[PDB]
Structures are given as structure tokens and as C-alpha cells.
Amino acid sequence: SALTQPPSVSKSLGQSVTISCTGTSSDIGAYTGVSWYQQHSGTAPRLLIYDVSKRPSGVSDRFSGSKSGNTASLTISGLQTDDEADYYCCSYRTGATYIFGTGTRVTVLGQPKGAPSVTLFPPSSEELQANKATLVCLISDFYPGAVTVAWKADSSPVKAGVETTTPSKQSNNKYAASSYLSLTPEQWKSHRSYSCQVTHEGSTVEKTVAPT
């Protein structure tokens, strides 16, 4: 009842990849109303291919489509970092309804490593007057999209009060994440300093703030 796609497909920069879309004889097997859509994280889908193999103006000829039986296929040549997105096939079905694929995430591998840029903010005076304390650790511009965050008060570990996001791709095709340390104003002022430690690959960058 769904158009079957590979959950994930990955190749390296410059290489070509092919994504399959397997449906039934009631859709892909029956019609030419097959279309493909590109969707980057946090954006609306974008038409890549329509009518099995046609390209709208604005789509590079690196994107191509074909069909054979109940399986449609999208090929991306010269894999680039922008091609790193989610891809959906679509087809008209018999009850004049439409049906989308399960989606495929394309990862392009041989990209340059990127060290995380870290900005650490102390609790604001406004938040402290409100009997709250939040440390804000902002982590940007790193690749690949895996990082580990650890918090220190003076020089000792903090396990409680820490909330950290999953990495997300930015507009620069690098990654960003954020970590939040929840504190009592006294906790913040009792220690000499607080630190956010960001460890990417093997290197570890540290930022430090003090209640001056």
C-alpha cells in the first residue's frame, strides 16, 4: 500500500547514486504520473522530477528519473553536499488518489572535517532575579554531525540539569547543536567557574564562564 524506498542511501562526493521506488501495478506500473521530491531539513518539499523523467527549469541535469515495471528510480550524479537531503517518490493511484514513498535519506560521505565553534553564555541577571539559572552552550560549524557535550562546575562533572539537542544541518551544510545546564542561582555563584566541553572526533574544545 506504500511505495517502498530504501531508508538510507550513501555514497561519496562526485559519485552517483540511484534510489528505487517500488509500488504496484495500480500506480507506478500503470501510469506516468510519477514524480520525485527533494526535502531538506526544516523546508517544504521541492519538485525534482515529474512524469517519470522530466525536469522542471531550475533542477540540475544531475537529477534524472526512470521507470521499469512497478519500480520507479531516481538517480543523482555528481553527489554534492547540497544533495544531502530526504527524497520522496510519488504516484497517482487508481482511485484517483496519490501515494508517497517511505522516503530516502541521502548521505554524502567524503566531506571535509569541521571543528565545532562554541559560544558559552552565563545566566543572565534577569533570569537570576527570577530565581532561575540556565547555562547556554551553542555549538556550530562542525562535521560530521556527531558531538559529545559534558559540563563542569569548577573541575567536577555535572550529570543533572543538562539538556542537549540532536545535531542538525545548518545553511552552511555544517552541523549545529545546543546544550542547556539548569541551575539554582546559588549553584551558579558557589562555584568559581562553569565550563562546557565539546568533543568532536578526537579534539575537545572548552569554554568557561564566571559570575563576574
Partner: protein, 210 residues
């Protein structure tokens, strides 16, 4: 310059109702079919409903029939989706899309429909005080998504980085928006973050100074 501007959406109780709207321009809203497509976080796209250029023919997904209604106004150039008896599983980003011919060029930006028993909470906004200096705004403890942040009411866009929200254990979201600015503008240029949380009609302007 075809546009599909969506509106509506927000937090609705389970069993509740919501109507989504899509304002079309830049093309004859007639002569074209329209669809609604939704996307649960973080799942794939699923087709919801189809309407022909006249409205004569309408089609629904089985997961939606009897509860969702599609309609269009060919004078107002608007597309609508009336949603009744909503469930937690109906929680998704909802897209409107123009049809060409059995394909769909041009999509709306999407609006988030959140079906939950949780209550709305507006965020508290705190300033993160500072060649190039980093400063920002903490947007703390709100529900549900989304939140928008602008700087100096749209004047400042370069160097602006708004981070995706963290989902706390409390069930509340928090994000931060940081802008890198020339240190020479500090103490001359005023920097105000403009935070908007529509589900609670919260609009906060916070001045960020060193």
C-alpha cells in the same frame, strides 16, 4: 512568483477541530488542482486530500476520511482543510501544494498542527549579553512549537543563527538565537530580539546590551 501562504494550526485538544487555510497567488488558482500533504515528526510525507480545479472532485486518504474536509474558493483563491475529531496521531506539519498534472510543483511553507492534552505555555525571554561579538536571546519554556525570532524587527538578518529547540523533560521547549555583530556597533547600534509565540499570542521584544 506563485505563492502558497498557509495559516491556522496550533495546539488542539484530542477530539478537537481545526481549520487550515492556504492563500494562493501568482497563478490562476482555478485551472489547477490542489492537495494537502502532512508530515509527522520526523516521518515521511503522506498525502491527505485532493481537490480538482472546480472543487467538483475531492479525494481523501483512508486515515482521514470522515474527519477531514477539503474545499476551495475560486474567488478568494484560497484552499481549506477542515479537520474534525483530531487525534495525537494527527500531529504533523501540514502542507498545501499546487498541482501541475499528476505532479505537484510549488508547496506552501507548512503549518504545524499539534494534537495534545498538554497546555499552551508562552516562553520567558532572556538576553544573552556580549571585530565581531556574539550576543543573543534565550527563549525559555514554551509549548508548543513553533517560535519565531527576528532581530531589530527584520533589519538585522546577517550573522543571525537561531538554534533548533531543545525538548526538556518537563515537556517544554527552549531555544536560543544568537547573532554575531561588529564590536564597533556595540554601544551605538541597538539590538532587539523579536520573539513570537503565536499559540499563546506571546510577542516579546527584548533589548540585548552588554
Amino acid at each position: 512568483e506563485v505563492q502558497l501562504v498557509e495559516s491556522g494550526g496550533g495546539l488542539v485538544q484530542p477530539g478537537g477541530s481545526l481549520r487550515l487555510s492556504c492563500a494562493a497567488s501568482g497563478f490562476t488558482f482555478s485551472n489547477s488542482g490542489m492537495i494537502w500533504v502532512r508530515q509527522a515528526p520526523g516521518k515521511g510525507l503522506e498525502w491527505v486530500s485532493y481537490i480538482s480545479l472546480s472543487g467538483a472532485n475531492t479525494y481523501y486518504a483512508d486515515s482521514v476520511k470522515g474527519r477531514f474536509t477539503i474545499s476551495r474558493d475560486n474567488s478568494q483563491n484560497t484552499l481549506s482543510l477542515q479537520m474534525n475529531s483530531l487525534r495525537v496521531e494527527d500531529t504533523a506539519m501540514y502542507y498545501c501544494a499546487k498541482e501541475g498534472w499528476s505532479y505537484f510543483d510549488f508547496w506552501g511553507q507548512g503549518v504545524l498542527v499539534t494534537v495534545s492534552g498538554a497546555s499552551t505555555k508562552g516562553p520567558s525571554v532572556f538576553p544573552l549579553a556580549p571585530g565581531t561579538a556574539a550576543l543573543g536571546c534565550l527563549v525559555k519554556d514554551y509549548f508548543p512549537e513553533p517560535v519565531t525570532v527576528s532581530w531589530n524587527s527584520g533589519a538585522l538578518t546577517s550573522g543571525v543563527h537561531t538554534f533548533p529547540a531543545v525538548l526538556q523533560s518537563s515537556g517544554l521547549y527552549s531555544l536560543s538565537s544568537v547573532v554575531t555583530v561588529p564590536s564597533s556597533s556595540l554601544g551605538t547600534q541597538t539590538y532587539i530580539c523579536n520573539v513570537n509565540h503565536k499559540p499563546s499570542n506571546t510577542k516579546v521584544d527584548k533589548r540585548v546590551e552588554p
